[PDB]
Each structure stands twice: as structure tokens, then as C-alpha cells.
Design an enzyme around this catalytic site. Structure first.
Site, short mmCIF file in Angstrom:
data_model
loop_
_atom_site.label_atom_id
_atom_site.label_comp_id
_atom_site.label_asym_id
_atom_site.label_seq_id
_atom_site.Cartn_x
_atom_site.Cartn_y
_atom_site.Cartn_z
N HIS A 1 15.56 -1.66 58.42
CA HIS A 1 15.25 -2.98 58.88
C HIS A 1 16.66 -3.81 59.37
O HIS A 1 17.23 -4.39 58.33
CB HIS A 1 14.40 -3.61 57.60
N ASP B 1 7.96 -1.44 56.94
CA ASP B 1 8.64 -1.56 55.60
C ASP B 1 7.52 -2.13 54.57
O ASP B 1 7.63 -3.06 53.84
CB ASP B 1 9.62 -2.58 55.74
#
Ligand SMILES: [Zn+2]
Ligand SMILES: [Zn+2]
Ligand SMILES: [Zn+2]
Ligand SMILES: [Zn+2]
Lengths: 426, 426
Positions: free
Chosen positions: B231, B304
Site C-alpha cells: 500500500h 489490504d
């Protein structure tokens, strides 16, 4: 006072060597031009030798106070003048460290007392360079501190570096850094490569340096602070900086004389006079430093004068310390293996030791402009001579260039119009 | 078994969408052509909907073992199927951690024992993710480790990462890293910018993430290891990677659906459903992510998936945990705010969730080829529908997109010829 050098060579504002004369009235460049008629000043004919502004060394180690035996402010300053420097910058890795008021004053005293040349003192980043507490950047700033750094060791704590850059940025100053990640030192004594592999010695990987430079560049951008890198030595280090300048980040760097002429392949054996930090790395890294110097990635050249005694370098390289003297080597060494070799022009070498170093830090120096302090150096490009540590004015005789024959030797240095050093037959 | 999807559309091996059918025989894509004929095959008319390969998510948190209340392997994998994913990679931040033979085996048991979708488990870099002792890559590799990471935490000690990458490089495996310098967290709960400022909250500087990415890149090159960034969320992080790729380094990255859709200016207030790590930063960072996903710097999209109970999220954003659900919102959220918006194409959206992740880590999934396992998902790109956490299969209902009207919802998902999930109401 009132001097007037006749028949010499100098670099005009266009960056080209043209023969002219130079007049000096009241420790200031009175007039610069050809056939400067001044029938009221002692004539000093330079017989066509090189006339240039005093050299600017932005990275030096005077050792005093702390180890006055390795070097002294007057002796280290004398040798410096012999090398042509009129303005040097001593590092804070001395004991006591210039981390407070009392210390910066006591150091600022020794200078204006026993220092044959301009000495801008480096302010420390953390007290005693312990890297756990930041110093008073305001005080040091007032006490005429050149810049902030913990040279010798690197700032391990990232948050300390960010804070340091924020504060330095406010004070409109730079943060100079000795990039080195301790967990990666691998306690080597040289570069981790071919040389360390053949003599079964621990080597220091390049990442130990490049990793910090990369980190600081981001912190610098985050604090919008002038960040300068000390003695670059790896291919990755130059790249990271090149990507940096391309983004418009206020970052600058330097490269040492020995890192431009020698690489690992030049170390004959485990000889302490070749051991310094950072070490001499691969030829791939060497070519990178040279390429960075030619494309702008590398802004200036600095000696990183690290004097030591023979008794210390005497013991094995593993036990021996890091450091090589460079004041009296710098120019002649670089003029022979760089300029004379073709790698760079005479105009560039000078700049890399005068106006470029000065501008990067905003100093009224490195320029032969009318109205500026008379910081001048006369250089003999013709005469060829060999490097002999026996004749060095510096206590530090630790040099790997002993025997090398060069040209371009400083014959006379002028600090403020007053002669600080003379050869002995010119 | 034998299925035949009639009258559909998909991404051909070129990039365009062409009406076609698909035949599944014995858990394999027996044929991908227009108008197929197989009498004995139980027909399934998708009516123009989109036929697509099972989505691949390389960043997930099933919470089991350890946080069964937050999410379970079965509740999490079924939620993945509903979201359209057929291949999930689970992070090792559970308790116990998959840092040895005995832990990897039991986790591998749980997976195959109650996973409704393919689940490739990540292996930890250091035991318990404490960061002081490296795990045994050799063995973990043997037991089926996907890659090596310490997700949720970063590898602070530089030498640890290098060693990890050198070791990973030899086993031809990737080092997946959660980039975060601990001394730069500043006890933040959100992004240090205009929002944290506006609400008197501590913020996490962008530099906290970019500094680790910059470090690891240099280490990955030295070790010559495949390094992957989780991320990404900052402008500086994207630049650092772009510079690394231009130099030919084996580095790759990813972005989450929420970081591609939201930024701090979108946070309504101190609502924990908007609290994740990395946090939602400035619009400047948001634009850089879009540009990065477009120029190729960011190689794929990862959710995520980070489920948390409603009660835990009921705490103030100061104490509340980081993380939001992503499985059941991923695609429709991206198809509505990115594709329909014209920011990217459907071809791109599908590749960022299929072939690209697979191609980067060397997986089979992500493609509708005649011979590949029947990992498929049919998606309705027309029917509009509001996102309602109350209708989620995941225990994690912690999402900030409640009420968002979207299109492109998966109506059916197939794992190896078998139907793992169906809309239940055409
Ligand atoms: Zn240094
Ligand atoms: Zn130094
Ligand atoms: Zn993470
Ligand atoms: Zn995560």
C-alpha cells in the site's frame, strides 16, 4: 599594504584562462587587468605562473582541541596555506565538541589567535555527537557557525535528522552529513569487494552509505532544507542524488581527491595509508564519481584532511585508524591525474575548489573580484615534483601518494593581502 | 461436472470486450469461444454480463489464528468469493505467527480445511515479527510460503532487511514490505496534514513511509532480490519507486482501493472507518497514486482487507485500530469511481486485479485461457446498487463507503469449476 603581481594567468568571468596582472591595495583586490600600471606597489612578477583565488576546503579536520598531537590549528592551517587554501572548514568531531556556547567561543578564540588562514567552524548537530540530544542551533548560528553536522559518525535516529533539518531550515542554513548506517558497517576496514576478498578482511558495503543519503534526501525535501552530502563514494550514492536534483530538491554533495584518482584496485596491500572512511571502492564506483563530477551531480571537491601519526598508522590496517592528509596534495595531485589527464579542464578544477564551493554555502569568496578580500594563490604548472611526506608542513604524513610526481604546486598563498606562505625559490 | 456460460462478454487476449461463451469441464476452462455447443452441459445464460477470471488479492488479513472474533478463514474467504476473488494471500500478522514449521503447517491445515477460496499464506521475516531473529526461509519456502513480510510492522534494523533479501534472492523469492520508520510515527492516528491540523490530532508524516521504501530499494539492488512495496500512499514514495525502476531494479508496488478513491479532504470527521495504515493523505499524494498507477510505477491493486469489530471501531480514532474491510467493495467501488469516471479502462481495472498480480509473483491465476483452472466470476456492470455493510458476509463491517451507489457487482464466483458464491436473487 600594496602589491601588484605581473605577467600571470587567470580565469576570467567567462571561464577561460587569459594572461593578466593583479593589483592588491589594503588587503583587497584593487584592480584586475592587463599591464596594470601602479608605480606605487612592490612588484612580484609571477613569470606566467597561475594566479587564482584562494582555495576553499569545506571539509577539514584540525584535531585541535582534543588530539593536538595529530595536528594543530596553526600547523594544520599552515599546511593548508601551502596547498593554496585561504578558507577551510573544520569539523566538530573534536574533544571537546563545539556543541554549546562556551565550546564554540573557546574554539572561535584559538582560531582568531593561532590560525594562519580563514577557519569557518562547523557546528555540531547533537551534543558530544552522541546523537541523542539536539544542540542549540540558534546559539551556534550566532557564534558564527558555518553549518551543522556530526561528521565522523552518522545521525542514526531518523526523527533527529528531520528535526535538525526543520530547525536548520528556519535559520536558513545547511545540514552536512557523514552518511553511515551502523548496522551495516560490518566492522570492515576497507571496501567490501575484491580487495577485502583476497586479504580475508571484512569490508564495508556501499549500502552503508547510500542508504543514509537516500533517507536524508526525503527528510530534506520534507523540511525544505539545504542538505549537503559528505565525500560521496558509491555508484548508488551518485544516482540517488541525481534523481534528487532532477526533482528539484535542495541537495548538494562533494567528492575527495583520493576518491577521484584511486579505487580499490590501486591498493597494493594492507597498507594503513590507504585506509579511510569512506574507503576506496570498485572501479565501477570510481567511474560513477567521475561521471557525477562531470554532469553536475557532484557540486564540489573537498579534501577531508584527516591527519594522523605514523605510530598509529604503523599497526595493522585493521587496528589502524581511518584518514589521509590532503591539504598539500589536493591541487597538484588533481591537476596531474585529472586536468593533465584530460578528464576535466583547468577551468573546472579551479571552480570545484573556489566559486562552486563558496556559492553552495553563500560565501564572499572563491572569486577574484575587485573589492573582495585578497585571498590569492600563485601556482607553478610547469615545474614537476614528487610527493614527499618528509617536506610536509602538516604533522599528518599519512599519504598513499608518497612518490607520485605532479605539477601545479602552490608557491605563495595570500590571506587578506598578507602572505601566509611562500615556497622557497620563486 | 460441466457448466456452459452463454451470451456473455470478456477481456480477449488483446484488450477489447467481445461477446463470447465459456465451457467448464472437470474444473478447467475447456473452451473460450463465441457460441459454444455442448448439449449435456448445464447451460447458464449470463445475459450480457461480464465473464472474468477470479480476482487475485495479494494483501489480506484473515485474522485467524488469533483474532477469530474479527474474522475467520471461512467467513473471510466466503466474503472474498462474494467480492469476486478466488486467490487470496494472507499476511503473517496473526497469533501464532507463521514463522516456523509447526505454525505454517497448522495454518496450512486450517486453510485447506475450511477455505472457500485459494489461500496462499505469507511467511514472516522475523520470529513473532519482533524483528530480532530471522525466520528459516528455506523451510517456510518448503511448506508453501507465498513471500516474506512482517506486515503491520516494518523491519527497523537495516542489516536484517539486507540479509533477508540476500537470502530471499537466493531462494528466488520476494521480500514484501510494510514501509514504516518507527521514529517517524509520532504517535499518529491519521495523516499529518490539513485534517490532523484541523482537529488537533497527531499525524503520521509521509516521510515515515517513503524513507523505508528508499532504504529497501538500495538494499534490494545490492542483494539483487525481488522487492515489493505494500500500500503505497505518498508522492515521495511513488517518485522513489519510479527512480528505482528507471535504473532497472527489481522492485514492484501496489495501491489499495481506498487510497485510489479517498484522501484526507474526504474524511468527514473523527470516524474510525476512515482510519487505516497507511492513512488517507493529501490530494497531492492522491494524484501521484493515480499518475503512478497509470505510468506503470504502481503494478497492481491490493485491498489490504483488514476487518475489525464494530465495538473496537466505536473507540475514538485515537485508540481505534487501523483497517477497513475491502473484499466486498473492491470492484464495484473501483468500477464506479475509476472506470465509469474515465480515469482508467475496464481492461486495466481487470488486469490490475488479475494477470498483473499473478505475473509479478509467478502465479497461474488471473487468466481465462483454455487449460487454466475454472477460477471465474460473472459481474453485472449495469444494475446499480448501494453498498450496505449490513449485507456483508465478512465479520468486518468497518467500511467508509456505506451508502455509495455503485455498479459492477459480482453476481457469481467459481473456484475450480465449483460455485463458491451466488447472488441468491437475480
Ligand atoms: Zn566523514
Ligand atoms: Zn571527515
Ligand atoms: Zn501494512
Ligand atoms: Zn496489511
Amino acid at each position: 599594504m600594496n602589491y601588484l603581481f605581473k605577467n600571470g594567468r587567470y580565469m576570467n568571468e567567462e571561464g577561460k584562462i587569459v594572461a593578466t596582472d593583479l593589483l592588491v591595495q589594503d588587503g583587497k583586490i584593487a584592480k584586475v587587468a592587463e599591464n596594470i600600471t601602479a608605480d606605487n606597489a612592490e612588484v612580484i612578477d609571477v613569470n606566467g605562473k597561475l594566479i587564482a583565488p584562494g582555495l576553499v576546503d569545506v571539509h577539514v579536520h584540525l584535531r585541535e582541541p582534543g588530539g593536538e598531537h595529530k595536528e594543530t590549528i596553526e600547523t594544520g592551517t599552515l599546511a593548508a596555506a601551502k596547498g593554496g587554501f585561504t578558507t577551510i572548514c573544520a569539523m566538530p568531531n573534536t574533544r571537546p565538541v563545539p556543541d554549546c556556547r562556551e565550546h564554540m567561543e573557546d574554539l572561535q578564540n584559538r582560531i582568531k589567535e593561532k590560525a594562519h588562514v580563514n577557519v569557518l567552524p562547523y557546528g555540531a548537530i547533537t551534543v558530544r555527537q552522541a546523537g541523542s540530544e539536539m544542540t542549540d542551533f540558534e546559539t551556534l548560528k550566532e557564534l558564527g557557525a558555518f553549518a551543522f553536522t556530526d561528521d565522523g559518525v552518522g545521525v542514526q535516529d531518523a526523527s533527529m535528522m528531520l528535526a535538525a533539518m526543520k530547525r536548520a531550515a528556519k535559520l536558513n542554513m545547511a545540514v552536512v552529513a557523514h552518511c553511515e548506517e551502523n548496522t551495516l558497517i560490518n566492522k570492515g576496514c576497507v571496501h567490501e569487494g575484491k580487495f577485502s576478498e583476497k586479504h580475508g578482511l571484512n569490508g564495508i558495503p556501499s549500502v552503508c552509505e547510500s542508504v543514509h543519503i537516500a533517507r536524508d534526501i526525503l527528510l530534506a525535501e520534507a523540511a525544505d532544507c539545504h542538505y549537503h552530502v559528505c565525500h560521496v563514494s558509491t555508484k548508488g550514492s551518485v544516482r540517488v542524488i541525481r534523481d534528487a536534483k532532477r526533482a528539484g530538491i535542495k541537495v548538494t554533495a562533494e567528492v575527495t581527491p583520493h576518491h577521484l584518482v584511486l579505487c580499490e584496485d590501486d591498493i597494493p596491500s594492507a597498507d594503513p595509508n590507504f585506509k579511510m572512511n569512506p574507503p576506496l571502492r570498485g572501479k565501477e564506483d570510481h567511474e560513477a564519481l567521475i561521471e557525477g563530477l562531470l554532469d553536475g551531480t557532484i557540486d564540489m571537491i573537498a579534501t577531508d584532511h584527516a591527519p594522523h601519526t605514523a605510530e598509529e598508522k604503523a599497526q595493522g590496517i585493521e587496528r589502524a585508524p581511518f584518514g589521509i592528509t590532503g591539504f598539500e596534495t589536493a591541487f597538484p595531485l588533481l591537476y596531474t591525474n585529472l586536468v593533465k589527464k584530460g578528464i576535466i579542464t583547468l577551468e573546472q578544477l579551479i571552480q570545484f575548489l573556489t566559486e562552486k564551493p563558496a556559492d553552495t554555502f553563500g560565501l564572499e569568496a572563491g572569486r577574484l573580484k575587485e573589492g573582495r578580500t585578497a585571498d590569492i594563490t600563485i601556482i607553478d604548472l610547469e615545474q614537476e615534483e614528487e610527493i614527499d611526506p618528509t617536506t610536509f608542513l602538516s604533522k599528518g604524513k599519512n599519504t598513499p601518494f608518497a612518490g607520485w610526481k605532479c605539477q601545479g604546486w602552490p608557491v605563495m598563498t595570500i590571506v587578506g593581502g598578507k602572505i601566509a606562505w611562500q615556497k622557497e625559490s620563486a
